[model samples]
Target: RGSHMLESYAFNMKATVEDEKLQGKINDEDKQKILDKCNEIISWLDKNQTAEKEEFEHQQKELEKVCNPIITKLYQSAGGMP
Candidate 1:
């Protein structure tokens, strides 16, 4: 269950980051940072293959903590708009 959910978060998050970048909702600099973090989790998923639920959740926390803040600011900027 945890592993499956984690897989969902990791890939889904990466896709979102790229999609936003394409949409011009985010900058490339900010984009790379999250992608790096996203890929790291993805890499770990492949390499370790042993983490339990809490760890997977924690991994997601690590991802969202960085992503959400950046994403928030962008949305607010869009709302506050050009």
Candidate 2:
């Protein structure tokens, strides 16, 4: 579910850049940051191997561990400071 979310966000970000109306709106560094952040999430998800319900839940927990900090930092950086 997290990967799905990340992929969707990434796709939307890419779409935004591809759209002429939004082209050049986001700088390369920003785009790359989004991509890199999502990739970090993806890499962690890839490392998780959940074979059973228990294992799957464990993986989900691990995913939370990785995602929470990234998302927290993202929001804070985007002016949603805590």
Candidate 3:
């Protein structure tokens, strides 16, 4: 899910930038910079993919731990609406 979201965002940005370049709304240098930035993002994704997933899951677990009690209390008070 995360990968697909990132892929879609990057693809859309690239497509929009390419269109702008073709329409003369942006120059070659500007387009090149954007492309370079995209490459950097892709590189980072590749390099940190595993660690990133691990860190995200760890954080998610911590978040669930912290929020579950509050949510449970809320539900009890609300007669279990949520």
Candidate 4:
């Protein structure tokens, strides 16, 4: 579920950014920066595939409705959520 959600969010963000209206103009530098940011994100995800308790708690407090349910389930199965 976590992996699925991660890929889904990646695809969704990718599609949204593909829109000219959302992305506007992309200079070569901007594209390189985005790639660099993605690499960092992937690295972080690799280091922490399953989110930690503190992060989960923070998200459960601050994250919006669209993601709360899914995140709650993930945390629950991982023994963090009640």
- Per residue, candidate 4 scores C-alpha lDDT tens digits across 7-74 of 56655555455555554547346655655565566557656755676688777777666687887777
Candidate 2 local lDDT, residue 78: 44
lDDT of 3 by residue, 1-82 (tens): 7876776667767777887427575567777788778767766767788888889999999999999999988767645454
Determine the backbone clash count of candidate 4.
0
CA lDDT of each prediction against the hidden true structure: 0.78, 0.67, 0.76, 0.61
lDDT of 2 by residue, 16-46 (tens): 5555655465666766676677667556655
- When sorted by TM-score, best at the front, the candidate numbers are 1, 3, 2, 4
Candidate topping lDDT: 1
Give the clashing pairs for model 2: none
Best by TM-score: 1
Candidate 1: which stretches are off by over 4 Å? Answer: 20-22, 50-82
Q: What lDDT would candidate 4 get against the real structure?
A: 0.61
Clashing pairs in 4: none
In model 3, which regions exceed 4 Å deviation? Answer: 19-23, 50-82
Error of 2 at 24 (Å): 3.4
Report how far residue 50 has shifted in candidate 3, in Å: 4.5
Instruction: Please identify which of the two predictions, 1 or 4, would achieve the higher lDDT against the true structure.
Output: 1
